[PDB]
Coordinates of C-alpha atoms and ligand atoms in Angstrom, one line a residue:
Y29 CA -116.7 54.4 -39.5
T30 CA -117.7 57.5 -39.2
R31 CA -117.5 57.5 -35.5
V32 CA -114.0 59.0 -34.0
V33 CA -112.6 58.6 -30.8
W34 CA -110.6 61.4 -29.7
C35 CA -107.8 60.9 -27.1
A36 CA -107.9 63.1 -24.0
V37 CA -105.2 64.3 -21.9
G38 CA -106.0 64.1 -18.2
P39 CA -109.7 64.4 -16.1
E40 CA -110.6 68.1 -17.6
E41 CA -110.3 67.1 -21.3
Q42 CA -111.9 63.8 -20.5
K43 CA -114.9 65.6 -18.8
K44 CA -114.8 68.2 -21.8
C45 CA -114.4 65.4 -24.3
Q46 CA -117.8 64.2 -22.6
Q47 CA -119.8 66.5 -23.4
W48 CA -119.2 66.6 -27.0
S49 CA -119.8 63.0 -26.6
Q50 CA -122.9 63.7 -25.4
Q51 CA -123.8 66.3 -28.0
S52 CA -122.5 64.8 -31.3
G53 CA -124.8 61.8 -30.8
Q54 CA -121.8 59.7 -29.7
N55 CA -120.4 60.2 -33.5
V56 CA -117.6 61.1 -31.2
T57 CA -116.4 59.3 -28.4
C58 CA -113.4 59.2 -25.6
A59 CA -110.3 57.6 -24.8
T60 CA -108.4 59.0 -21.7
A61 CA -104.5 59.0 -20.6
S62 CA -102.4 60.6 -18.4
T63 CA -100.1 62.0 -20.9
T64 CA -99.5 63.0 -24.9
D65 CA -97.1 60.5 -25.7
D66 CA -99.7 57.8 -24.0
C67 CA -102.1 59.3 -26.2
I68 CA -100.3 58.6 -29.7
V69 CA -99.4 55.2 -27.9
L70 CA -103.7 54.7 -28.4
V71 CA -103.3 56.5 -31.6
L72 CA -100.8 53.8 -32.9
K73 CA -102.6 50.9 -31.2
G74 CA -105.8 52.0 -32.9
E75 CA -107.2 52.4 -29.8
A76 CA -108.0 56.1 -30.3
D77 CA -108.0 58.4 -33.8
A78 CA -107.3 61.6 -32.8
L79 CA -106.1 64.8 -31.1
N80 CA -104.9 67.9 -31.0
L81 CA -101.2 68.7 -30.5
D82 CA -98.4 70.7 -30.4
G83 CA -95.7 71.1 -32.9
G84 CA -93.3 69.6 -30.7
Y85 CA -95.5 66.4 -30.1
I86 CA -96.2 66.8 -33.8
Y87 CA -92.9 65.7 -34.4
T88 CA -92.6 62.9 -32.2
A89 CA -96.1 61.4 -33.6
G90 CA -94.4 62.2 -36.9
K91 CA -91.8 59.8 -36.9
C92 CA -94.3 57.1 -35.4
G93 CA -96.1 57.3 -39.0
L94 CA -98.6 59.9 -38.0
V95 CA -99.8 62.7 -39.9
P96 CA -101.5 66.2 -40.2
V97 CA -105.2 66.3 -40.8
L98 CA -106.7 69.8 -40.1
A99 CA -104.6 72.7 -38.2
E100 CA -105.9 75.2 -35.2
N101 CA -106.7 78.7 -37.3
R102 CA -107.2 81.9 -35.5
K103 CA -108.1 85.5 -36.5
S104 CA -105.8 87.5 -38.9
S105 CA -105.7 90.6 -40.4
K106 CA -104.6 90.0 -44.0
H107 CA -106.0 87.3 -46.6
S108 CA -109.8 88.6 -45.4
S109 CA -112.0 87.1 -48.2
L110 CA -111.3 83.5 -47.4
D111 CA -113.0 81.6 -45.3
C112 CA -111.4 80.5 -42.4
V113 CA -111.3 76.9 -43.3
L114 CA -109.7 77.5 -46.3
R115 CA -107.5 80.6 -45.4
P116 CA -103.8 79.4 -44.5
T117 CA -101.8 79.1 -41.2
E118 CA -99.4 82.0 -39.7
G119 CA -98.6 80.2 -36.9
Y120 CA -97.9 82.0 -33.2
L121 CA -94.8 83.7 -32.0
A122 CA -92.8 81.9 -28.7
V123 CA -91.7 84.8 -26.2
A124 CA -89.7 84.9 -23.0
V125 CA -92.0 86.8 -20.2
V126 CA -90.6 88.4 -17.2
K127 CA -91.9 91.1 -14.6
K128 CA -91.1 94.6 -15.5
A129 CA -90.1 95.0 -11.8
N130 CA -87.8 92.7 -12.2
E131 CA -85.0 95.5 -13.6
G132 CA -82.1 94.5 -15.6
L133 CA -83.3 90.8 -16.4
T134 CA -82.6 90.4 -19.8
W135 CA -81.7 87.3 -22.2
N136 CA -77.8 87.8 -21.1
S137 CA -78.8 87.5 -17.2
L138 CA -81.1 84.0 -17.7
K139 CA -78.6 81.7 -16.0
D140 CA -79.4 80.4 -12.1
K141 CA -82.7 82.4 -12.6
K142 CA -86.5 80.5 -12.3
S143 CA -88.2 79.5 -15.2
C144 CA -91.8 78.2 -16.4
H145 CA -92.2 75.8 -19.2
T146 CA -95.5 74.7 -20.3
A147 CA -94.1 71.5 -20.6
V148 CA -90.9 69.5 -21.7
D149 CA -91.1 68.5 -25.7
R150 CA -93.3 71.5 -26.3
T151 CA -92.4 74.1 -28.8
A152 CA -92.8 77.5 -27.1
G153 CA -92.2 76.5 -23.6
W154 CA -89.3 73.8 -23.9
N155 CA -88.1 73.5 -27.8
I156 CA -87.1 76.9 -28.6
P157 CA -86.2 78.4 -25.8
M158 CA -83.7 75.5 -24.7
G159 CA -82.8 74.8 -28.2
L160 CA -81.1 78.5 -28.3
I161 CA -79.5 77.9 -25.0
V162 CA -78.0 74.7 -25.4
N163 CA -76.7 76.5 -29.3
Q164 CA -75.9 79.5 -27.6
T165 CA -73.8 77.7 -24.0
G166 CA -72.0 74.6 -26.4
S167 CA -73.4 72.5 -23.9
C168 CA -76.1 69.9 -23.7
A169 CA -77.0 70.6 -20.1
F170 CA -79.8 72.3 -20.0
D171 CA -80.6 71.0 -17.0
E172 CA -78.7 72.9 -15.0
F173 CA -78.9 75.9 -16.8
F174 CA -82.0 77.9 -14.5
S175 CA -81.7 77.2 -10.4
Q176 CA -85.0 76.2 -10.6
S177 CA -88.4 75.5 -13.2
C178 CA -91.4 73.9 -13.6
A179 CA -91.1 72.0 -16.8
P180 CA -94.2 69.2 -16.6
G181 CA -93.0 66.2 -18.1
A182 CA -89.3 66.3 -16.4
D183 CA -87.8 64.1 -13.2
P184 CA -90.2 65.1 -10.3
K185 CA -87.2 65.0 -8.0
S186 CA -84.7 67.0 -10.6
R187 CA -84.9 71.0 -10.0
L188 CA -86.4 71.1 -13.8
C189 CA -89.7 70.7 -11.5
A190 CA -88.9 72.0 -8.0
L191 CA -91.0 74.9 -9.0
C192 CA -94.1 72.5 -9.8
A193 CA -97.1 72.2 -7.8
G194 CA -99.1 69.7 -8.8
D195 CA -102.8 69.6 -8.3
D196 CA -105.3 71.0 -5.1
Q197 CA -104.1 68.6 -3.4
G198 CA -100.5 68.5 -4.1
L199 CA -100.8 65.1 -5.7
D200 CA -99.7 65.2 -9.3
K201 CA -96.6 67.6 -9.2
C202 CA -95.3 68.0 -12.5
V203 CA -97.5 65.5 -14.6
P204 CA -97.6 66.9 -18.0
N205 CA -101.7 67.4 -18.1
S206 CA -103.7 69.8 -16.9
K207 CA -103.8 68.6 -13.3
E208 CA -101.0 70.2 -12.8
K209 CA -101.4 74.1 -11.9
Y210 CA -98.9 75.6 -14.3
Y211 CA -99.2 73.5 -17.0
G212 CA -99.2 74.3 -20.7
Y213 CA -99.8 78.2 -21.7
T214 CA -102.1 79.5 -19.4
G215 CA -99.7 77.6 -16.1
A216 CA -96.6 78.5 -17.1
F217 CA -97.9 82.0 -17.2
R218 CA -99.7 81.9 -13.6
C219 CA -96.2 80.5 -12.4
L220 CA -94.4 84.0 -13.4
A221 CA -97.4 85.8 -12.3
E222 CA -97.3 84.5 -8.9
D223 CA -93.9 85.1 -8.7
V224 CA -93.1 81.4 -9.0
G225 CA -90.7 82.1 -11.7
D226 CA -88.6 84.5 -12.8
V227 CA -89.6 83.9 -16.4
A228 CA -92.2 82.3 -18.7
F229 CA -91.6 80.9 -21.8
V230 CA -95.4 80.8 -23.7
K231 CA -96.6 82.4 -27.0
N232 CA -97.8 86.0 -27.6
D233 CA -101.8 85.6 -27.4
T234 CA -101.2 83.9 -23.7
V235 CA -100.0 87.2 -22.3
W236 CA -103.3 89.2 -23.8
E237 CA -105.7 86.8 -23.3
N238 CA -105.4 86.6 -19.4
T239 CA -104.4 90.4 -18.7
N240 CA -106.3 93.8 -18.4
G241 CA -109.7 92.0 -17.6
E242 CA -109.6 89.7 -20.2
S243 CA -109.5 86.4 -18.1
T244 CA -111.5 87.0 -15.1
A245 CA -109.6 83.8 -13.1
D246 CA -108.8 85.0 -9.9
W247 CA -105.3 84.6 -10.4
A248 CA -105.3 86.8 -13.3
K249 CA -107.9 89.0 -12.6
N250 CA -105.9 91.9 -11.4
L251 CA -103.1 91.5 -14.5
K252 CA -102.2 94.4 -16.3
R253 CA -100.2 94.7 -19.7
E254 CA -97.5 97.4 -18.7
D255 CA -96.2 95.6 -15.5
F256 CA -95.1 92.7 -18.3
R257 CA -91.8 92.6 -20.7
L258 CA -90.3 90.6 -23.5
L259 CA -86.9 89.5 -23.5
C260 CA -85.7 89.7 -26.8
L261 CA -82.6 87.9 -28.1
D262 CA -80.1 91.1 -28.6
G263 CA -80.3 91.3 -24.9
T264 CA -83.0 94.1 -24.9
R265 CA -86.3 94.4 -23.0
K266 CA -89.9 95.6 -25.1
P267 CA -93.6 95.9 -24.2
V268 CA -95.9 92.9 -25.1
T269 CA -97.4 95.3 -27.9
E270 CA -93.8 94.9 -29.7
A271 CA -94.1 91.1 -30.2
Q272 CA -93.8 91.4 -34.0
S273 CA -90.3 92.7 -33.3
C274 CA -89.7 90.8 -29.7
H275 CA -89.8 86.7 -30.4
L276 CA -88.0 83.4 -30.7
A277 CA -89.1 82.3 -33.5
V278 CA -92.6 81.9 -34.7
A279 CA -94.4 78.7 -34.4
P280 CA -96.4 76.3 -36.4
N281 CA -100.0 75.9 -35.3
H282 CA -101.3 73.2 -33.1
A283 CA -102.5 70.4 -35.2
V284 CA -105.2 67.5 -35.2
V285 CA -102.6 64.4 -36.1
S286 CA -103.9 60.8 -36.9
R287 CA -102.9 57.6 -39.0
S288 CA -102.5 58.0 -42.4
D289 CA -105.3 55.1 -42.6
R290 CA -107.8 57.0 -40.8
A291 CA -107.1 60.6 -41.7
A292 CA -109.6 60.6 -44.5
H293 CA -112.5 60.1 -42.0
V294 CA -111.3 61.7 -39.2
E295 CA -110.8 64.9 -41.4
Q296 CA -114.7 64.8 -42.8
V297 CA -116.3 63.7 -39.3
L298 CA -113.9 67.1 -38.1
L299 CA -115.5 69.5 -40.6
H300 CA -118.7 68.6 -39.7
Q301 CA -118.3 68.8 -35.7
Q302 CA -116.9 72.4 -36.4
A303 CA -120.0 73.2 -38.6
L304 CA -122.1 72.5 -35.7
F305 CA -119.7 73.3 -32.3
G306 CA -117.8 76.2 -34.1
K307 CA -117.1 79.5 -33.9
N308 CA -120.1 80.6 -35.9
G309 CA -121.9 76.7 -35.3
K310 CA -125.5 75.5 -35.1
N311 CA -125.2 74.8 -31.3
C312 CA -122.7 77.1 -30.0
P313 CA -123.4 78.9 -27.8
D314 CA -126.5 77.2 -27.5
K315 CA -125.8 73.6 -26.4
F316 CA -121.9 72.9 -26.8
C317 CA -119.0 75.0 -28.0
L318 CA -116.2 73.0 -29.4
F319 CA -113.4 75.9 -28.6
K320 CA -114.5 77.0 -25.2
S321 CA -113.1 75.9 -21.9
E322 CA -112.7 79.4 -20.1
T323 CA -109.0 80.0 -20.2
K324 CA -107.7 76.7 -19.8
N325 CA -107.5 75.5 -23.3
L326 CA -109.0 72.2 -22.9
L327 CA -108.5 69.8 -26.5
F328 CA -108.3 73.0 -28.5
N329 CA -106.5 76.2 -27.6
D330 CA -109.8 79.0 -27.0
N331 CA -108.8 81.5 -29.2
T332 CA -109.1 78.8 -32.5
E333 CA -111.5 80.2 -34.8
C334 CA -111.8 77.4 -37.0
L335 CA -109.9 74.1 -37.8
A336 CA -108.2 74.8 -41.2
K337 CA -107.8 72.6 -44.2
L338 CA -104.0 72.2 -45.3
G339 CA -102.4 73.4 -48.0
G340 CA -100.4 70.8 -50.4
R341 CA -101.3 67.5 -48.6
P342 CA -98.1 68.1 -46.2
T343 CA -96.4 65.7 -44.3
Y344 CA -95.3 66.1 -40.8
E345 CA -92.1 67.7 -41.8
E346 CA -93.3 69.9 -44.2
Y347 CA -96.0 71.1 -42.0
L348 CA -93.7 72.0 -39.0
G349 CA -91.0 73.3 -41.7
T350 CA -87.2 72.8 -42.3
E351 CA -86.6 75.3 -40.0
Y352 CA -88.0 74.2 -37.0
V353 CA -87.3 70.4 -37.8
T354 CA -83.6 70.9 -37.8
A355 CA -83.8 73.1 -34.5
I356 CA -85.4 70.0 -32.5
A357 CA -83.0 67.2 -34.4
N358 CA -80.1 69.2 -33.0
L359 CA -81.9 69.6 -29.3
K360 CA -82.7 66.0 -29.1
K361 CA -79.3 65.3 -29.7
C362 CA -78.6 66.1 -26.6
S363 CA -81.3 64.2 -24.8
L364 CA -82.3 60.1 -36.2
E365 CA -84.4 57.4 -37.9
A366 CA -86.4 56.5 -34.6
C367 CA -90.3 56.5 -33.0
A368 CA -89.7 56.3 -29.3
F369 CA -92.2 53.6 -29.1
Ligands
LIG13 C1 -100.5 88.7 -29.9 O1 -101.8 87.9 -29.6 C2 -102.6 89.2 -29.6 C3 -104.1 88.4 -29.2 O2 -104.6 87.2 -29.8 C4 -103.0 89.5 -30.7 O3 -104.5 90.8 -31.0 C5 -105.5 90.5 -31.1 O4 -105.8 90.5 -32.6 C6 -106.5 89.9 -32.8 C7 -106.9 90.2 -34.8 O5 -105.0 90.3 -34.8 C8 -107.7 91.2 -32.5 O6 -109.1 90.5 -33.0 C9 -110.1 91.8 -34.0 O7 -111.5 90.9 -34.0 C10 -112.3 91.0 -33.0 C11 -113.6 91.4 -33.8 O8 -113.5 92.2 -34.4 C12 -112.0 93.1 -32.1 O9 -112.7 93.1 -31.3 C13 -112.6 92.0 -30.3 O10 -114.1 92.0 -29.5 C14 -114.3 90.7 -28.8 C15 -115.2 91.4 -28.0 O11 -116.9 90.4 -28.4 C16 -113.3 90.4 -27.7 O12 -113.8 89.0 -27.3 C17 -112.0 90.6 -28.0 O13 -111.0 91.2 -27.3 C18 -111.6 92.2 -29.0 O14 -111.8 92.9 -28.1 C19 -110.5 93.1 -32.3 O15 -110.2 94.4 -32.2 C20 -109.7 92.8 -33.5 O16 -110.0 93.6 -34.3 C21 -108.1 90.6 -30.8 O17 -108.7 91.8 -30.3 C22 -106.7 90.7 -30.7 N1 -106.4 90.2 -29.0 C23 -107.0 91.1 -27.8 C24 -106.6 90.2 -26.4 O18 -106.4 92.3 -27.8 C25 -101.8 90.4 -31.4 O19 -101.9 90.7 -32.6 C26 -100.5 89.6 -31.3 N2 -99.6 90.5 -31.3 C27 -98.7 89.7 -32.6 C28 -97.6 91.1 -33.0 O20 -99.1 88.6 -33.4
LIG14 C1 -78.7 75.2 -33.0 O1 -77.7 74.6 -33.7 C2 -77.5 74.1 -34.9 C3 -76.3 74.1 -36.0 O2 -75.7 75.3 -36.2 C4 -78.9 75.0 -36.0 O3 -79.0 74.2 -37.4 C5 -78.7 75.1 -38.3 O4 -79.6 75.6 -38.9 C6 -80.2 76.5 -40.0 C7 -81.3 77.3 -40.1 O5 -82.0 76.2 -40.1 C8 -79.5 75.4 -41.6 O6 -78.8 76.2 -42.7 C9 -80.5 76.4 -43.3 O7 -80.0 75.9 -44.9 C10 -80.9 75.8 -45.8 C11 -80.3 75.0 -46.7 O8 -79.3 76.0 -47.6 C12 -81.1 77.1 -46.2 O9 -82.3 77.0 -47.2 C13 -81.7 78.3 -45.1 O10 -81.9 79.4 -45.6 C14 -80.7 78.0 -43.5 O11 -79.4 79.1 -44.4 C15 -79.0 74.7 -40.9 O12 -78.1 73.7 -42.1 C16 -78.7 73.8 -39.8 N1 -77.3 73.4 -39.0 C17 -77.2 71.6 -38.9 C18 -75.8 71.6 -38.3 O13 -77.7 71.1 -38.2 C19 -80.2 75.6 -35.5 O14 -81.1 76.3 -35.9 C20 -79.6 75.7 -33.6 N2 -81.2 75.8 -32.7 C21 -82.2 76.9 -32.9 C22 -82.9 76.4 -32.1 O15 -81.7 77.8 -33.6
LIG15 O1 -99.5 76.3 -38.9 C1 -98.8 77.7 -38.6 C2 -97.3 77.1 -39.0 O2 -97.5 76.5 -40.1 C3 -96.5 76.1 -40.6 O3 -96.6 75.2 -41.4 C4 -97.7 75.1 -41.9 C5 -97.7 76.3 -43.3 O4 -97.2 77.2 -43.2 C6 -96.2 77.1 -44.8 O5 -95.7 78.0 -44.8 C7 -95.5 79.9 -45.2 C8 -96.4 80.2 -45.4 O6 -96.9 80.1 -47.3 O7 -97.6 80.3 -44.5 C9 -97.9 81.8 -44.7 C10 -99.7 82.0 -44.7 O8 -100.0 80.8 -44.3 C11 -97.3 82.6 -44.8 O9 -96.9 83.7 -44.2 C12 -96.3 82.2 -45.6 O10 -96.3 82.8 -46.9 C13 -97.5 76.6 -45.7 O11 -96.8 77.1 -47.2 C14 -98.8 76.5 -45.5 O12 -99.3 76.1 -46.6 C15 -99.1 76.1 -44.3 O13 -100.3 76.1 -43.8 C16 -95.0 76.8 -40.8 O14 -93.8 76.1 -40.1 C17 -95.1 77.9 -39.6 O15 -94.5 79.2 -40.3 C18 -96.3 78.1 -39.3 O16 -97.1 79.1 -40.9
LIG16 C1 -123.2 61.7 -36.7 O1 -123.3 61.3 -37.9 C2 -124.5 61.7 -39.1 C3 -123.7 60.8 -40.2 O2 -123.2 61.8 -40.9 C4 -125.0 62.8 -39.3 O3 -126.2 62.2 -40.8 C5 -125.4 63.1 -38.0 O4 -125.5 64.7 -38.5 C6 -124.8 63.2 -36.8 N1 -125.1 64.0 -35.8 C7 -124.7 64.3 -35.3 C8 -125.2 65.5 -33.5 O5 -123.4 65.2 -35.0
LIG17 FE1 -97.5 75.6 -28.8
LIG18 ZN1 -89.1 86.6 -36.2
LIG19 ZN1 -95.4 67.7 -49.8

């Protein structure tokens, strides 16, 4: 009923979910899975109700009948008067980041280099860059393009996982959850920051949130914006201040999905949960903040201002957009009446 079971990916998200559960009086409860895909499955079975997903998984989930309910909304500049929950979503910029000291490394010389991806199947870390690379190469062997990488979710024995490090014990190497050191936006960027990889496929925001004192995490403490460069599709290199003219694409924001028969109810519970634990929430920062977790982006991205209502009750195809939807279809022809489970 007004009770919602959230699906947590990995033990760290489980921990944050439990706090949220404790503070919600149990209006929100938790289920945990090792992978986002397993979480998709728990929702289909009806053992969990919702979770926040990157666009790539929204695509997987959509083919299986799950729908967009509310989307992450971060601070903008245009469309000022509108409240956050009513304001349109902008989408983030997918970028390719390199070290400035690594001269002569451009989009046109990425072959045989070392890469850092958020996870297999994600928008900025995989779908966009690999779709572009397959497109340009005219060959479905994206697994041979880079010499070594860390792409959580690929075969641990393959070169796509050679750069991944697992947890502090060396266990769970390449798993697509935060236990993997170089998982997600922050992980992929850390992979580049520590010179494990030559390039990182992350979003524009990740660079800003983890440099010039914004992080304080020990690996990011001393990172400086000028030491990084974005790779543009025209073979050029630009400062990270130029993301508007040097991105690989703009991605649809992450969004909360659920089985359609449960959407209306998940929507009403969440809107109330954010009134309590959101940005200007009754109990944040006092008791619990839904959008905080110190640069780890647990359950939701840390830069989320609020969860917004979607305009025009969009299907997953409309929400992702035709442009992005055909990009994925074309890449998956390498790896359509579907649903993977
Ligand atoms: C690439 O991604 C970066 C990071 O997301 C984008 O830069 C961000 O732009 C925001 C708006 O477009 C900036 O937020 C506004 O609101 C706050 C409050 O008014 C301003 O100051 C903040 O103060 C708090 C202190 O409590 C700090 O937490 C913030 O760091 C900031 O100092 C801010 O000046 C601005 O008016 C936001 O600050 C900014 N983020 C950072 C880390 O600088 C960037 O636009 C984007 N590029 C493109 C092309 O999209
Ligand atoms: C990989 O290559 C494929 C195939 O060339 C790319 O797909 C193509 O994408 C374009 C742009 O999305 C599609 O064109 C669009 O057509 C509509 C209809 O007129 C129009 O409104 C848009 O303005 C645009 O012109 C095109 O149909 C599609 N081609 C095929 C065969 O699917 C794909 O984008 C490439 N991958 C990446 C990541 O770019
Ligand atoms: O979530 C962010 C992404 O949304 C994707 O689909 C959802 C979103 O986008 C549509 O598109 C373009 C446009 O209307 O959005 C803004 C302001 O929101 C503009 O810049 C545009 O005019 C749709 O019409 C929206 O209602 C919806 O919220 C989309 O594929 C991505 O581009 C990105 O916006
Ligand atoms: C839990 O749900 C009830 C039913 O709407 C609501 O009245 C109450 O405020 C909620 N409590 C918390 C802590 O969210
Ligand atoms: Fe993403
Ligand atoms: Zn563009
Ligand atoms: Zn529609």
